Design a protein around this motif. Structure first.
Motif: not given
Lengths: 61, 61, 61, 61, 61, 61, 61, 61, 61, 61, 61, 61, 61, 61, 61, 61, 61, 61
Positions: B9-19, B36-50
């Motif tokens: 598993k590479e760059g994974v968000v899983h198993g989140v419970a919120t009330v 004001t909320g629930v935010t989930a971001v999963a990335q494997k590779t990001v490339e750039g300069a700035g």
């Protein structure tokens, strides 16, 4: 890279439980940043020169 | 890269419970940012300069 | 790249459960950004020079 | 790239359950951005120079 | 690219269940953007120079 | 590209269930954009220079 | 491109179920855009220079 | 392109079920756009320079 | 292009079921566009320079 | 009993969030009782002589 | 009983979020009882002599 | 009983969100009871002498 | 019983969202009971002597 | 019973959304009971002596 | 019974959305009962002595 | 019974949307009962002594 | 019974939308019962002693 | 019975839309019952002693 019969986890967020309860909440904002919540970020590789990988509640001028 | 009979598993968000429970909520905003909320971001590779990979509640001027 | 009889997950968001309850909510906004909800982003590869990959509640001037 | 008898997931959002309940909600907006809902984005490859891949509640001037 | 007896998913959104209930909702808008609903976007490849791939509640001037 | 006895899904949205119930809803709009509904977009390849692939509730000036 | 005994889905939206119920709904609009419904778009390839592929509730000036 | 004993779907919308019920609905419109219904668009290839492929509730000036 | 014993679907909309029920509906319109119904469009190839392929509720000036 | 402008909760279970993850689980049972899950019971009044109000994993002979 | 302008909850279960993930599960049962899931029971009044109000995984002989 | 301008909930289950994922599941049963799912029961009044109000996975001999 | 301008809910189940995914499932049964699904029961009044109000996965001999 | 300008719900099930996905499912049954699906029962009043009101997956001998 | 300007719902099931997808399903049955589908029952009053009101997947001997 | 300017629903099933998709299905049956479909039953009053009101997949001997 | 300017629904099924798609289906039956379809039954009053009101897939011996 | 300026529906089935598509279907039957179709029954009053009101796929011996 070579894996033979292996199990790996690389850059993972998992198993998060949260309960919140508020009676009265008030937010007054001018041009800044306010974050009140649940945030989860998982990354494997970020490459650059002057980049920003993860930011929560950030002000840049 | 070579995997033989492996699990990864590479760059994974899983198993989140919120009330959440709020009785009275008020937000007043001028040209900034409020989250004001629930935010989930999963990335494997990001490339750039700035570049900016992940941002939540961000103000840039 | 070579996989032989393997299982992988790369850039995945899965297994999210949320319950929310509000009695009174009010939002007043001028030309900024407000986000109150559930947001999920999953990416494998983002490439550029000065790009922005994922942004939630962002103000750029 | 070569897969022989393998199972992969690349850039996937799956398994999201949400329940919301509000009694009174009011939104007043001037030329900014407000997002209150469920948003899911899944991408495999985004390429460019100064592009924007995923944005929710974004103001650009 | 070569797959032999494999199963893959690339840029997929699946398995989303949502229930919403509101008693009174009011939205007043001037020339900005407001989004209150369910939105799902799945893409495999987006290419360009200064393009925008996915945007929900976006204001550009 | 060569597939031999394989199953793939590329740029697919599937399995979405939604229930909504509102008692009183009012929307007042001036020349902006408001979206309150269910929206699903699935694309495999989008190419261009300064194009926009997917947009929901977008204002461009 | 060559497929031998394979099954693929490329740019597909399928399996969407929705139930909605409103008692009183009112919309007042000036020359902007309002969308309240179910919208599904599936595309395989879109090519251009400054084109727009998919847009729901969009204002261009 | 060559398929030998294969099954494919490219740019397809299928399997959509919707039930709606409203007691009182009123729409007042000036020269903008309002869409309240079920809309489904499926395309395989769209080519151009500054074209628009799919648009629902769009205002262009 | 060559198919040998294959089954394909390219640009197809199929399997749509809808039930609607309204007690009182009123529409007042000035020279804009209003669409309240079921619309389905399926196309295989559209070519041009500045053309419009599919449009529902569109105002052009 | 008389309440004038008051708020009460009597026999209520609310705000529970749980995440569980198991790799291998095995249960062998003879005529007893096994319970492995989430159980919530809320009661206001139970009356009797030799009754049982709430029981989880109970054996009576 | 008399309530004047009050809000009460009596025998209510609300706000429960759960995420579960298992790789291999096996259950072997002889004439007993096994329960592995989510169970919620809400009751206001139960009356009797030797009754059983709520039971999960119960064996009676 | 007399309510004047009040809001009550009596014997109610509401706001439950669940996500489950299993790879391999096997159940072998002889004349007992097995329950693996989501169960919700809401009752206001149950009256009797030796009755059973709510039971999940119960064996009686 | 007398209500004057009040709102009540008595014996109600509402707001349940569930997502399930299984790869391989097998059930072998002899004359017992197995339940694997979503079950919801709402009752206001049940009266009797030795009755059974709600039962899921029950064996009686 | 007397209601004057009130709103009530008594014995109601509403707002249920479910998504299920299985790859291989097998059921072998001898003279017992198996239930794998969505079941909803709503009742206001059930009266009797030794009756059974609601039963899902029940064996009686 | 007397209602003056009131709205009631008694024994009602409404607002249910379900999506199911199976690749291979097999059922082998001997003289028992198997139910795999969507079932909804709504009743107001059932009266008797040893009657059965609602039953899904029931075996009686 | 007397209603003056009121709206009621008693024993009603309404607002059900379902989508199903199966690739291979096989059923082998001996003298039992199998039900795989959509079933809806709405009744107001059922009276008797040892009657059966609603039954789906029932075996009686 | 007396209604003055009222609207009622008693024993009604309405608003059902279903889409089904199967590639290969096979049914082998001996003297039992199999039902695979859409069934809707609405009744107001059923009276008797040992009668059966509604039955789908029923075997009686 | 007396109605003055009222609207009622008693024992009504209305608003049903269904789409079905099968590639290969085979049914083998011995002296039992098989039903695969759309069936709708609406009745107001059925009276008797040991009668059967509505039956679909029923075997009586």
């Amino acid at each position: 890279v070579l894996y033979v019969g292996s199990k790996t986890k690389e850059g993972v967020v998992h198993g998060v439980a949260t309960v919140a309860e508020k009676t009265k909440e008030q937010v007054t904002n001018v041009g800044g940043a306010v974050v009140t919540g649940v945030t989860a970020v998982a990354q494997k590789t970020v490459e650059g020169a002057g980049s920003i990988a993860a930011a929560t509640g950030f002000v840049k001028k």
